[PDB]
């Protein structure tokens, strides 16, 4: 049960690493879009208080 719990908490993330490539413009583009979205949302939450 402990080993399965750790695997459940890692497996959702290591999917990006297993296929990691030093040259991958699609991965870079989607990471950019997600981080920009997260920045805008975090700034709005932090200053508005919502």
């Amino acid at each position: 049960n402990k080993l399965q719990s750790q695997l459940l908490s890692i497996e959702k993330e290591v999917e990006e690493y297993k296929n990691f490539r030093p040259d991958d413009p699609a991965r870079k583009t989607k990471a950019l879009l997600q981080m920009v979205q997260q920045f805008a949302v975090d700034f709005e939450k932090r200053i508005e208080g919502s």
């Binding site: 695997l7 290591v14 990471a31 920009v36 805008a40």
Partner: protein, 50 residues
């Protein structure tokens, strides 16, 4: 409305979105952990089967 349009205008879009060394080291450690953990669960399986 504008932030992404400006980010596409900076630099040369080749060095932007380049991973730091720490993310590469974390990637390697996470993949090692993942594979060893699956191996541990395979061995527990085999032991219970006998």
């Amino acid at each position: 409305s504008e932030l992404l349009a400006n980010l596409y205008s900076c630099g040369d879009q080749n060095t932007l979105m380049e991973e730091s060394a720490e993310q590469a080291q974390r990637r390697d450690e996470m993949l090692r952990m993942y594979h060893a953990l699956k191996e541990a669960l395979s061995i527990i399986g085999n032991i219970n089967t006998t």
